[PDB]
Structures are given as structure tokens and as C-alpha cells.
């Protein structure tokens, strides 16, 4: 206590409990919420529990505690890399597929561990903790952070103090992401996070089962902001002890490995009850041990992982497309959507790597320029079962003329989407080479560049595909 | 890891790997889903998730390990012919990147709220999961 914070949080829940004010008005609602948070944050002591030394000084303690329970601690070391921060560096030669990490479940922080810890009585009654493990795991991290007699202390002491999540960004830092699609998701991160902090700061003060928790003495925003940021950036799903379902988990040691493109090599072996990572490629002595974090977009990387990966082959931007209710052909097209698994409208993605379109967006865009005759060609006939199946195959064009329409539509839409951005692709390239941006600012701007960089490959491909199908009218081939 | 979902008095498995006894105790089938459901006498201890989770962990039989995957929504996707099914419309197929080779059909995919699906297709560095969450009728009686 004080409860000024409780009054300051009371407002955050309600304001953050509001629906979206609109587009263009969200920034005003964003800064409304940050100001109130900044008031609370500047009225609180920051991280409730702070470690006396520096981060790296606690890495040897991690290895011993891990080695006491059977974790691989040889073949790598803790090195502060410039480009990715702390990571693992091979102390010997590691071949491809060579298993070099194994971590028993006893060391991992899992929601099943949360339900068995001091948070368990609170989890028993709270439905939000019961529902969202990413939060429930964050509180498990904070509960044991404020517990000196904790099994997982050597792990928490290695965890960072700050992260590059948009939760840590400044208003100028988020100011660069305006007119983009990611910022609409960056807001959702801040809003939901803030809202959860307001809900939970109350419940700890009011719930009896929280009386024994050490968070009742101190539960700041910088605590919670660090907590969920810790979870969203280094969480991995593993099965529970019963194996009946999965659960989120903070896998120690394995999470310090940074990211490079490739395939997911990290698996959990329930038979051995432990996590196993095989080498993605050949790691010479002194080379950093990377892992593959997943096929996530650079938007998800900034928002959920906290960095921008160059040369990501899985970068993509969303695009909202739908059948306008002003269509004379709705009812005939309303049949396909239930049998082709396509919603009436939804978010589709334009992909960086070839092809920019998906087989499912093409399965939406093809039907978005058909005539009445071609709508009964898929519905009535001995080829109606084979043709709806070959709706995503580019080598099965439904009709030659429809092709140019679909690339024309995208030519119009994509060029429009470039206009929507506050800057141009040419201006963004110069700003990274010529300006001195914050570590976080560099992340956000490269994304705003990336988003436009994705479309530029979608525009010319649409242009290349449009000219191609336009050439087809001359030969009159079958 | 039995290669099948055991809930209540029901047994769910890929249609192309089912034993004849499954057809002897047939409850429901679909060639367009690679999904077969059979009646059992015991009470399976698997919970059907009714979530829209899109990040889950699946068992890779060839690697004998569980793997987290980000898979797309239940959708009708082209599957080229294999030794089991010639190419034909296949719906409710969540696709993700991972290792899935012949014999890996049967890996149980799960979300934080329970089971999501079961491996149906593979190839080209992708793994296909046949969705089950939709079948609410698949619950306790
Ligand atoms: N390509 C990349 N560039 C920069 N940072 C990266 C990265 N891939 C992963 N990271 C870092 O990895 C963090 C999750 S844990 C990875 C270990 C990290 N060295 C550490 O000291 O914690 C991310 O939040 C991000 O800071």
C-alpha cells in the first residue's frame, strides 16, 4: 500500500476495456494509455527484485544447478554477441543433426509447475490465469524471482533486465511505425498487457489466496512488463507430465540460443522426459550456436520476439479482402465459401518469397472475378469435384481472362497500399544507412521498410504475371 | 503415443491406417478428412480442445519426439497422390513446417486447451494435420 496505484490502475482497466476508437484515432488512444502507465511507472520503484551483480556473473551458477540435475553443459559457452546479445558459442566442433542440448523437465518452468507452486491457489480461482498460460507463466517467473529459496533462481538471475519488445519502446520509437499494419498489432500488445496489469494488481490486493504471495508487497509495471516480455520472447510449448495436452515452458539454457533461418530442430522427448535440440548446421569451434525460433513474420518478431531478422524467408504482411455485399453474384459465391473453407472475409498474407500470393489467397481472388458461367462449372459436372480441388493450383488456371483481372486488382490494391504508408521505400533505405537510430528504432523502421519491401515483390510479380497471361490471348492455345 | 485420440467411448484415427475392427465398430468416416472414428468400451483420457490455437506440438514418429509447429487454419488443400490416397479434395488440413515421413501419420497435435488434430499428410518439408476440434459431437455422452 499505497492505493494511489490501485486508483491509477482502476482507470487503466476501464480505459483499456474500451473497444477500438477507429483507425487514425488509435494513436490518440495509445498515448492516452501510455501516459497513465508512465505516471504509474514513474511512481513505482521499477523492478521489485533486482540482482546485486551483473547478468553474466550468474551464468556459471546456472551451469552447476543445471549439471546437478542432468543438463548438457559442455560444447558451448556464454558470449555477449554484438548482433544478437548473449548467446551460445561452440567450444568444439558440432556437426549437423548432432544432439548437443538436453534439459530435464524438472528444470523447466511450466504452467503445471505454476499450478503446483504458490500461484496455484490463485490459479485455482482466477479464470484469466487459468486461461492464458503466457501470463500464468509470467507470474510463476515473478513469484520465484521474489523467492530467495527458489530452485529456479539460477535461471531467473541469468534473465535480462530489459527487452526490445514494443512494451519498452518510446513514443518517438513507436512514432516511426504509423500507417503500417504492425502498429495496429503493436497497440494490441500494449493495450492487453496494460489491461492485464490493472486487473492483476487489484486481485493480488483483494484475493485471500494472494495474501501469502510476495507480490502483495510489490507488483510494479516494470515487473509485469519484464515478466510477460520474458515469456513471449523465450517460451516453447511442451507436453505436460500426463502428455494429455501441451503447456508453455521456459526451457533454461536452450533459450539463450539466438536465431538464424532454417528448420525447427528443437524437440521434447517425453520418454526421457527432457528437451533435446539437435544442431541445425555445422557449428565450428568459436561459432555461435543458433536455433530456429519458428516461421514467424517480422511483425511477430518485433512484437513477440523483440528483434528484426534480415533475410527472413517467412516475412509476410496481412491483407483484408472480402466479398462486398454489393455483389449481384453473392448467393452463387456464398456456396463455395462453406465448401472451399473460405470465410466471407478474413486476413490473408502477401509473402516475401516466391510466390507472393498463396494458394489460399488465389483460391479467394480467383472466385473474386469469375462470371456466372464459371461458377456453375465448379458446382455441376463430373469435373466439379476435381476442379474445386485444383482451385489453388497455378498450373490449373480456372480461366485465362480471370488471371489478368486478379493481377490487375492486386496491381490497384498493392499500389494503393504503398500510398497508405507515411514514407516511401526509397526514403527508408537511406535512413538506416545514414541515421543513428536506437536499437529499437532500427527494428521498427526496418519492419516498415520490410512491409513495403514485401509489396514491391508482390507488385512486380503481379505485373510479371499479368503481362504473362496477357500474352496468352494471341496463341489461342487449348 | 497410440497414434489415435481416445476420448469417452470413441476412438479417432486416420482413415487409411484403421484396423478392420475399427470398421467393425464404425461410428463415422470421411475420406475428405483422412479421419475415422470408432466406438470403444473404455473411457479414453484425451480431452478435445475447442480452441482456435494455431501453435501446437506434434509427435514425429520417425524422430520419436514432439515438435512445436505453427499451422494454418483448417482449409481444403491440394494433396498430391501417395500410396494411400490418389489426389482428391482434402479439407480441414492444417499445414505447418516440420519433419513428417511415412509412418509419422498418427502424431497427436495439441493446443494448451487439449488435442488439436492428428497427422494426415506430409511431404515437401510440410506436415498436414486433420482437424478434429470441429466435431463437438465427439464428447462425453
Ligand atoms: N536475430 C536476432 N537479432 C537480435 N536479437 C535476437 C535475434 N534472435 C534472438 N534474439 C534475442 O533473443 C532473445 C530471446 S532469448 C535468446 C538469448 C539472448 N542472447 C539473451 O541474452 O536472452 C530475444 O528477445 C532477442 O533479444
XYZ file of C-alpha atoms and ligand atoms in Angstrom:
645
model
C 0.000 0.000 0.000
C -0.291 2.934 -1.321
C -3.513 2.553 -3.274
C -2.923 5.611 -5.485
C -1.606 2.938 -7.854
C -4.805 0.981 -7.238
C -6.764 4.101 -8.336
C -4.377 4.707 -11.261
C -4.813 1.013 -12.299
C -8.633 1.165 -11.768
C -8.773 3.712 -14.692
C -6.400 1.657 -16.871
C -8.676 -1.344 -16.729
C -11.690 0.718 -17.789
C -9.962 2.739 -20.487
C -8.174 -0.263 -21.836
C -11.518 -2.104 -21.582
C -12.869 0.113 -24.391
C -13.285 -1.097 -27.982
C -11.055 0.322 -30.785
C -11.781 4.257 -31.276
C -11.248 3.667 -35.012
C -8.348 3.944 -37.462
C -6.249 7.152 -37.183
C -7.775 7.625 -33.739
C -5.892 4.630 -32.182
C -2.643 6.608 -31.706
C -4.573 9.060 -29.549
C -5.935 6.140 -27.531
C -2.442 4.619 -27.351
C -0.821 7.736 -25.872
C -3.795 8.045 -23.516
C -2.922 4.659 -22.026
C 0.888 5.120 -22.019
C 0.649 8.457 -20.164
C -1.330 6.804 -17.349
C 1.151 3.876 -17.305
C 4.102 6.264 -17.323
C 2.533 8.079 -14.341
C 2.291 4.746 -12.523
C 5.726 3.644 -13.637
C 7.356 6.909 -12.538
C 5.517 6.489 -9.209
C 6.917 2.978 -8.643
C 10.380 1.660 -7.784
C 10.850 -0.216 -11.072
C 11.828 -3.872 -10.807
C 10.705 -5.110 -7.384
C 13.625 -7.558 -7.105
C 16.995 -6.525 -8.522
C 20.137 -8.649 -8.666
C 23.219 -7.203 -6.990
C 25.728 -8.135 -9.692
C 25.577 -8.024 -13.480
C 23.885 -10.557 -15.757
C 26.840 -12.627 -16.985
C 28.167 -13.090 -13.430
C 25.310 -15.586 -12.869
C 25.974 -17.867 -15.862
C 28.403 -20.235 -14.051
C 25.818 -20.671 -11.279
C 23.303 -21.690 -13.956
C 25.512 -24.482 -15.306
C 26.154 -26.051 -11.887
C 22.491 -26.049 -10.859
C 21.668 -27.483 -14.287
C 24.514 -30.019 -14.077
C 23.217 -31.033 -10.638
C 20.038 -32.174 -12.414
C 21.442 -33.551 -15.672
C 21.626 -30.791 -18.288
C 24.158 -30.691 -21.110
C 26.681 -28.027 -20.086
C 29.595 -28.901 -22.407
C 30.134 -27.996 -26.052
C 29.178 -24.311 -25.780
C 29.750 -21.159 -23.740
C 28.130 -17.851 -22.778
C 29.331 -14.994 -25.018
C 27.889 -11.481 -25.448
C 27.418 -11.200 -29.203
C 27.064 -7.749 -30.732
C 24.287 -8.506 -33.224
C 22.086 -10.763 -31.070
C 23.194 -10.161 -27.460
C 24.135 -13.062 -25.191
C 24.095 -16.446 -26.888
C 25.826 -19.802 -27.046
C 29.237 -20.204 -28.675
C 30.539 -23.629 -29.650
C 33.560 -24.675 -27.593
C 34.092 -27.592 -30.007
C 33.031 -28.713 -33.483
C 29.315 -29.591 -33.708
C 28.158 -31.498 -36.798
C 24.703 -31.296 -38.361
C 21.970 -33.265 -36.524
C 24.368 -33.655 -33.587
C 22.339 -33.517 -30.375
C 24.100 -31.032 -28.087
C 21.393 -29.957 -25.597
C 19.235 -31.970 -23.218
C 17.236 -30.426 -20.368
C 15.035 -32.445 -17.983
C 11.529 -31.154 -17.346
C 12.356 -30.669 -13.642
C 14.335 -27.538 -14.570
C 11.691 -26.080 -16.882
C 9.141 -23.613 -15.598
C 5.779 -24.921 -16.857
C 2.153 -24.000 -16.081
C 1.831 -27.433 -14.402
C 4.636 -26.104 -12.171
C 2.618 -22.902 -11.685
C -0.489 -24.812 -10.566
C 1.698 -26.632 -8.010
C 3.513 -23.529 -6.704
C 2.242 -20.627 -4.568
C 0.441 -19.272 -7.640
C -1.638 -22.456 -7.642
C -4.136 -21.338 -5.013
C -4.617 -18.057 -7.021
C -4.727 -20.014 -10.334
C -7.432 -22.171 -8.704
C -9.829 -19.233 -8.510
C -8.750 -16.835 -11.266
C -10.043 -17.677 -14.744
C -7.640 -15.379 -16.616
C -4.602 -17.089 -15.079
C -6.332 -20.414 -15.784
C -6.870 -19.431 -19.432
C -3.709 -17.622 -20.569
C -0.531 -19.517 -19.731
C 1.753 -16.837 -21.175
C 0.558 -14.649 -18.300
C 0.332 -17.533 -15.823
C 3.927 -18.430 -16.662
C 4.968 -14.787 -16.248
C 3.608 -14.733 -12.692
C 5.365 -18.027 -11.952
C 8.553 -16.281 -13.103
C 7.874 -13.288 -10.833
C 6.746 -15.390 -7.854
C 10.042 -17.306 -7.879
C 12.048 -14.176 -8.704
C 10.971 -12.723 -5.337
C 11.689 -16.047 -3.583
C 15.327 -16.353 -2.423
C 14.880 -20.056 -1.611
C 13.830 -20.955 -5.196
C 15.005 -23.922 -7.257
C 14.894 -21.847 -10.439
C 16.762 -18.820 -9.051
C 19.936 -19.588 -11.088
C 17.750 -19.383 -14.206
C 15.986 -16.117 -13.318
C 19.306 -14.481 -12.394
C 20.529 -15.065 -15.967
C 17.423 -13.469 -17.474
C 17.774 -9.948 -18.910
C 16.692 -6.742 -17.203
C 15.081 -5.108 -20.248
C 13.865 -6.320 -23.642
C 13.320 -4.809 -27.089
C 9.578 -5.522 -27.094
C 7.311 -2.599 -28.116
C 6.401 -2.562 -24.422
C 9.828 -0.965 -23.839
C 9.654 1.421 -26.846
C 9.337 5.239 -26.542
C 6.690 7.349 -28.261
C 9.199 8.501 -30.902
C 10.154 4.801 -31.335
C 6.526 3.874 -31.951
C 6.101 7.109 -33.939
C 8.005 5.518 -36.837
C 5.508 2.657 -37.239
C 2.467 4.807 -38.088
C 0.310 3.980 -41.141
C 1.663 0.407 -41.062
C -0.173 -2.816 -40.258
C 2.199 -3.925 -37.483
C 1.420 -0.835 -35.381
C -2.210 -1.990 -35.251
C -0.810 -5.116 -33.581
C 1.776 -3.230 -31.519
C -1.159 -1.392 -29.928
C -2.940 -4.666 -29.111
C 0.214 -5.782 -27.292
C 0.401 -2.638 -25.145
C -3.362 -2.452 -24.541
C -3.865 -6.080 -23.493
C -0.667 -6.050 -21.399
C -1.673 -2.831 -19.626
C -5.222 -4.140 -19.062
C -3.890 -7.366 -17.537
C -1.610 -5.414 -15.191
C -4.592 -3.378 -13.972
C -6.744 -6.478 -13.422
C -3.996 -8.395 -11.624
C -2.727 -5.608 -9.353
C -6.259 -5.458 -7.957
C -6.714 -9.211 -7.482
C -3.476 -9.599 -5.511
C -4.707 -6.861 -3.154
C -8.205 -8.375 -2.823
C -7.802 -12.151 -3.157
C -7.155 -14.027 0.123
C -5.201 -16.761 -1.688
C -2.781 -13.996 -2.764
C -2.072 -12.966 0.850
C 0.908 -15.348 1.033
C 2.336 -14.199 -2.303
C 5.385 -11.894 -2.174
C 3.839 -9.765 -4.945
C 1.416 -8.176 -2.458
C 4.430 -6.249 -1.141
C 5.498 -5.034 -4.601
C 3.953 -5.594 -8.058
C 5.104 -2.785 -10.351
C 4.515 -2.393 -14.074
C 8.221 -2.870 -14.821
C 7.827 -6.199 -13.009
C 4.898 -7.293 -15.167
C 6.309 -5.715 -18.329
C 9.539 -7.673 -17.855
C 7.596 -10.840 -16.934
C 5.344 -11.294 -19.970
C 8.142 -9.957 -22.190
C 10.354 -12.715 -20.782
C 7.660 -15.281 -21.590
C 6.643 -14.147 -25.077
C 10.281 -13.977 -26.207
C 11.669 -17.331 -24.958
C 8.630 -19.583 -24.461
C 8.392 -23.037 -26.015
C 5.400 -25.364 -25.896
C 5.985 -28.786 -24.327
C 3.622 -31.572 -23.296
C 2.553 -31.924 -19.674
C 3.658 -34.799 -17.449
C 0.435 -36.613 -18.343
C 1.076 -35.822 -22.019
C -2.669 -35.282 -22.447
C -2.142 -31.705 -23.530
C 0.584 -29.144 -24.078
C 1.804 -26.349 -21.825
C 4.014 -23.327 -22.165
C 7.509 -23.612 -20.795
C 10.617 -21.546 -20.174
C 13.341 -24.035 -21.149
C 16.548 -22.904 -19.398
C 19.864 -22.832 -21.298
C 18.087 -23.706 -24.565
C 16.597 -20.184 -24.655
C 19.779 -18.293 -24.787
C 20.400 -19.559 -28.336
C 19.690 -16.845 -30.902
C 18.009 -17.179 -34.294
C 19.044 -17.898 -37.876
C 16.933 -19.085 -40.804
C 16.350 -22.803 -41.285
C 14.092 -25.515 -39.862
C 12.866 -26.220 -36.336
C 15.221 -28.724 -34.692
C 14.184 -28.453 -31.021
C 12.127 -31.375 -29.747
C 10.910 -32.721 -26.423
C 11.358 -36.429 -25.632
C 8.596 -37.428 -23.213
C 10.076 -40.932 -22.894
C 13.237 -39.371 -21.442
C 11.108 -36.505 -20.032
C 13.514 -33.874 -21.361
C 14.099 -31.284 -24.110
C 16.542 -32.107 -26.911
C 17.980 -29.731 -29.546
C 19.920 -31.098 -32.497
C 22.290 -28.853 -34.412
C 20.728 -27.017 -37.339
C 24.011 -26.952 -39.274
C 27.746 -27.401 -38.681
C 28.969 -25.190 -35.813
C 32.750 -24.842 -35.879
C 34.718 -24.091 -32.726
C 34.020 -20.474 -31.809
C 30.917 -20.113 -33.989
C 27.672 -19.112 -32.309
C 25.159 -21.900 -31.756
C 21.927 -20.782 -33.407
C 18.480 -22.359 -33.341
C 15.357 -21.767 -35.415
C 12.680 -19.899 -33.460
C 9.902 -20.572 -35.973
C 8.200 -19.497 -39.207
C 7.051 -16.166 -37.790
C 6.684 -12.823 -39.542
C 8.968 -9.886 -38.798
C 5.866 -8.278 -37.283
C 5.577 -11.176 -34.828
C 9.362 -10.982 -34.396
C 9.254 -7.355 -33.257
C 6.069 -7.811 -31.222
C 6.582 -11.276 -29.698
C 10.341 -11.896 -30.067
C 11.853 -8.400 -29.972
C 14.156 -8.139 -32.991
C 14.131 -7.854 -36.779
C 15.748 -10.715 -38.714
C 17.384 -9.819 -42.022
C 16.743 -12.134 -44.990
C 13.724 -13.752 -43.330
C 12.138 -16.027 -45.936
C 8.877 -16.134 -43.949
C 8.182 -12.397 -43.809
C 4.621 -11.507 -44.761
C 2.030 -8.759 -44.353
C -1.680 -9.226 -43.804
C -4.266 -8.009 -46.377
C -8.015 -7.780 -45.665
C -10.111 -8.982 -48.576
C -13.847 -9.770 -48.605
C -16.901 -10.189 -50.787
C -18.749 -6.871 -50.786
C -22.469 -7.322 -50.018
C -22.985 -5.029 -53.077
C -22.328 -8.050 -55.361
C -25.029 -9.489 -57.683
C -23.122 -12.798 -57.548
C -23.075 -13.263 -53.725
C -25.509 -16.173 -53.422
C -23.748 -18.201 -56.121
C -20.416 -17.348 -54.480
C -21.899 -17.923 -51.000
C -21.908 -21.666 -51.768
C -18.169 -22.016 -52.420
C -17.124 -20.390 -49.137
C -18.541 -23.168 -46.950
C -17.277 -25.951 -49.236
C -13.945 -24.239 -50.015
C -13.266 -23.471 -46.339
C -13.010 -19.755 -47.157
C -14.665 -17.210 -44.826
C -16.781 -14.394 -46.218
C -13.823 -12.127 -45.354
C -10.585 -12.528 -43.409
C -6.928 -11.560 -43.205
C -4.709 -13.078 -45.895
C -0.985 -12.643 -46.302
C 1.361 -11.472 -49.040
C 4.572 -13.470 -48.724
C 8.115 -12.246 -49.349
C 9.456 -15.337 -51.105
C 8.253 -16.700 -54.429
C 5.279 -16.862 -54.931
C 3.994 -13.665 -53.277
C 0.418 -14.980 -53.386
C -0.727 -18.072 -51.505
C -2.680 -20.991 -52.900
C -5.455 -19.971 -50.476
C -5.467 -16.265 -51.379
C -5.534 -17.317 -55.022
C -8.412 -19.596 -54.011
C -10.130 -16.399 -52.809
C -9.021 -13.962 -55.540
C -9.846 -16.351 -58.475
C -13.525 -16.558 -57.394
C -13.437 -12.750 -56.900
C -13.506 -12.115 -60.693
C -15.469 -15.110 -62.113
C -18.513 -14.792 -64.366
C -21.794 -16.658 -63.896
C -20.860 -19.478 -66.288
C -17.637 -20.412 -64.476
C -19.485 -20.514 -61.154
C -21.592 -23.482 -62.329
C -18.517 -25.208 -63.787
C -17.329 -25.987 -60.245
C -20.808 -26.843 -58.911
C -22.452 -29.088 -61.536
C -20.474 -31.882 -63.617
C -18.079 -34.818 -63.405
C -15.194 -32.334 -63.070
C -16.792 -30.334 -60.251
C -15.066 -32.416 -57.578
C -11.687 -32.286 -59.337
C -11.898 -28.563 -60.152
C -12.651 -27.221 -56.664
C -9.664 -29.281 -55.510
C -7.426 -27.622 -58.206
C -8.594 -24.119 -57.177
C -5.184 -23.348 -55.661
C -3.034 -24.838 -58.449
C -1.428 -22.135 -60.594
C -0.884 -24.608 -63.443
C -4.637 -25.201 -63.469
C -5.942 -21.726 -64.359
C -9.701 -21.594 -63.917
C -9.850 -19.163 -66.838
C -7.263 -17.237 -68.833
C -9.085 -13.884 -68.690
C -9.698 -14.057 -64.924
C -5.930 -14.204 -64.389
C -5.282 -10.694 -65.738
C -8.214 -9.407 -63.652
C -6.757 -10.844 -60.446
C -3.343 -9.330 -61.104
C -4.997 -6.041 -62.098
C -6.971 -5.994 -58.833
C -3.765 -6.562 -56.869
C -1.944 -4.005 -59.037
C -4.575 -1.494 -57.914
C -4.727 -2.618 -54.279
C -0.983 -3.041 -53.755
C -0.171 0.336 -55.319
C -2.838 1.833 -53.049
C -1.235 0.153 -50.023
C 2.116 1.766 -50.862
C 0.373 5.157 -50.869
C -1.120 4.472 -47.424
C 2.335 4.465 -45.821
C 3.616 7.783 -44.493
C 7.015 7.373 -46.214
C 8.428 5.682 -49.312
C 10.641 2.640 -49.810
C 13.454 4.858 -51.130
C 13.427 7.155 -48.090
C 13.526 4.214 -45.669
C 16.699 2.688 -47.136
C 18.624 5.940 -46.692
C 17.544 6.422 -43.051
C 19.140 3.145 -41.936
C 22.461 3.807 -43.673
C 22.670 7.497 -42.739
C 20.969 7.973 -39.339
C 21.846 6.847 -35.794
C 18.708 5.133 -34.572
C 18.046 3.443 -31.273
C 18.336 -0.343 -31.217
C 14.531 -0.425 -31.015
C 14.002 2.308 -33.615
C 16.130 0.340 -36.087
C 13.822 -2.650 -35.531
C 10.575 -0.762 -36.170
C 11.769 1.165 -39.229
C 13.277 -1.895 -40.932
C 9.851 -3.514 -40.487
C 8.070 -0.540 -42.071
C 10.640 -0.915 -44.846
C 10.099 -4.686 -44.935
C 6.323 -4.326 -45.234
C 6.779 -2.112 -48.294
C 9.574 -4.415 -49.486
C 7.111 -7.326 -49.423
C 4.583 -5.459 -51.571
C 7.205 -4.360 -54.120
C 7.849 -8.041 -54.810
C 4.090 -8.654 -54.928
C 3.532 -5.728 -57.322
C 6.160 -6.686 -59.909
C 5.176 -10.359 -59.686
C 1.551 -9.370 -60.249
C 2.889 -7.185 -63.060
C 5.003 -10.055 -64.405
C 2.095 -12.498 -64.102
C -0.376 -10.010 -65.616
C 1.756 -9.373 -68.714
C 2.274 -13.137 -68.994
C -1.415 -14.061 -69.128
C -1.996 -11.060 -71.418
C 0.450 -12.643 -73.894
C -1.668 -15.821 -73.859
C -4.576 -14.330 -75.842
C -2.573 -14.321 -79.089
C -1.688 -18.019 -79.401
C -5.248 -19.174 -78.533
C -3.920 -22.409 -77.048
C -6.197 -25.060 -75.512
C 1.564 -42.323 -28.092
C -1.060 -44.681 -29.510
C -1.491 -42.858 -32.824
C -5.151 -42.164 -32.067
C -7.390 -39.942 -29.944
C -9.138 -41.846 -27.144
C -11.969 -39.822 -25.596
C -15.066 -41.249 -23.931
C -16.448 -44.223 -25.838
C -14.853 -43.064 -29.104
C -11.595 -43.797 -30.922
C -10.367 -41.376 -33.608
C -7.627 -42.228 -36.112
C -6.557 -41.622 -39.709
C -8.980 -43.403 -42.020
C -6.213 -45.013 -44.115
C -4.454 -46.682 -41.146
C -7.522 -48.058 -39.335
C -7.807 -51.717 -38.404
C -10.716 -53.774 -39.716
C -12.130 -53.845 -36.175
C -12.481 -50.055 -36.448
C -14.829 -50.558 -39.401
C -16.465 -53.313 -37.340
C -17.191 -50.652 -34.698
C -17.692 -47.788 -37.155
C -19.228 -44.552 -35.872
C -18.333 -42.035 -38.596
C -15.934 -41.685 -41.524
C -14.771 -39.179 -44.134
C -12.340 -39.771 -46.987
C -12.124 -35.984 -47.451
C -10.660 -35.640 -43.940
C -8.490 -38.770 -43.515
C -10.398 -39.254 -40.268
C -12.059 -42.375 -38.893
C -13.962 -42.641 -35.610
C -14.754 -45.952 -33.911
C -16.545 -46.967 -30.723
C -14.612 -48.201 -27.689
C -15.748 -49.687 -24.385
C -13.128 -47.968 -22.227
C -13.050 -44.261 -21.373
C -10.170 -42.529 -23.118
C -8.317 -39.874 -21.150
C -7.717 -37.440 -24.037
C -9.522 -34.089 -23.905
C -10.754 -32.483 -27.122
C -9.689 -28.859 -27.324
C -12.357 -26.464 -28.559
C -9.747 -23.742 -29.041
C -8.532 -21.929 -32.139
C -4.902 -22.421 -31.120
C -2.533 -22.234 -34.085
C 0.689 -23.119 -32.264
C 0.873 -26.718 -31.098
C 3.236 -29.633 -30.545
C 3.074 -32.818 -32.623
C 4.778 -36.188 -32.306
C 7.175 -37.096 -35.121
C 7.231 -40.897 -35.233
C 10.374 -41.017 -37.387
C 12.159 -38.792 -34.854
C 10.309 -40.259 -31.831
C 9.918 -36.716 -30.486
C 7.391 -33.918 -30.046
C 7.808 -30.766 -32.145
C 6.180 -27.321 -31.847
C 4.603 -26.096 -35.085
C 2.718 -23.039 -36.350
C -0.003 -24.318 -38.681
C -2.554 -22.567 -40.871
C -6.337 -22.746 -40.398
C -8.475 -25.820 -41.189
C -8.533 -25.464 -45.034
C -9.165 -27.520 -48.209
C -5.621 -28.042 -49.521
C -4.162 -29.816 -52.546
C -2.532 -33.132 -51.628
C -0.638 -34.979 -54.347
C -1.269 -38.717 -54.601
C 0.657 -41.201 -52.453
C 0.491 -44.965 -51.885
C -2.724 -44.468 -49.842
C -4.967 -41.755 -51.348
C -4.860 -40.596 -55.024
C -5.102 -36.758 -55.136
C -8.724 -35.823 -54.139
C -10.283 -32.839 -52.286
C -8.969 -32.870 -48.669
C -10.439 -30.345 -46.231
C -9.671 -29.312 -42.648
C -5.927 -29.724 -43.249
C -3.732 -27.543 -41.063
C -0.271 -27.214 -42.639
C 2.986 -26.388 -40.869
C 6.708 -26.845 -41.421
C 8.275 -29.903 -39.829
C 9.521 -33.411 -40.462
C 6.716 -35.816 -41.411
C 7.594 -39.026 -43.260
C 5.590 -42.220 -43.914
C 4.798 -43.767 -40.550
C 4.513 -40.370 -38.851
C 0.787 -40.345 -39.668
C -0.837 -40.534 -36.234
C 1.139 -37.874 -34.347
C -1.238 -36.108 -31.965
C -1.232 -32.311 -32.262
C -2.416 -30.429 -29.170
C -3.145 -26.866 -28.039
C -2.854 -25.520 -24.486
C -6.534 -26.484 -24.074
C -6.071 -30.066 -25.317
C -5.866 -32.043 -28.557
C -5.949 -30.149 -31.868
C -5.597 -32.780 -34.556
C -3.720 -35.775 -35.901
C -1.159 -36.080 -38.694
C -2.709 -36.915 -42.059
C -0.375 -35.722 -44.825
C 3.300 -34.925 -45.293
C 5.836 -34.015 -47.923
C 7.878 -31.081 -49.249
C 9.070 -30.299 -45.720
C 5.474 -29.790 -44.557
C 3.241 -31.752 -42.191
C -0.536 -31.966 -42.533
C -2.891 -32.282 -39.579
C -6.503 -33.393 -39.886
C -8.592 -31.157 -37.630
C -10.930 -32.658 -35.037
C -11.946 -29.713 -32.820
C -14.976 -29.136 -35.094
C -16.707 -32.380 -34.182
C -18.338 -31.332 -30.949
C -20.482 -34.497 -31.256
C -17.181 -36.076 -30.170
C -17.553 -35.527 -26.403
C -18.909 -37.346 -23.372
C -22.482 -38.623 -23.503
N 18.327 -12.224 -34.856
C 18.350 -11.672 -33.663
N 18.821 -10.395 -33.545
C 18.837 -9.847 -32.341
N 18.450 -10.375 -31.186
C 17.988 -11.641 -31.333
C 17.907 -12.339 -32.504
N 17.378 -13.620 -32.280
C 17.135 -13.684 -30.974
N 17.499 -12.501 -30.366
C 17.386 -12.210 -28.955
O 17.000 -13.391 -28.262
C 16.084 -13.029 -27.136
C 15.330 -14.226 -26.571
S 16.350 -15.348 -25.583
C 17.836 -15.627 -26.566
C 19.137 -15.444 -25.799
C 19.676 -13.983 -25.766
N 21.104 -13.918 -26.162
C 19.571 -13.388 -24.377
O 20.585 -12.798 -23.944
O 18.491 -13.510 -23.791
C 15.247 -12.045 -27.946
O 14.396 -11.291 -27.100
C 16.330 -11.165 -28.620
O 16.851 -10.194 -27.763
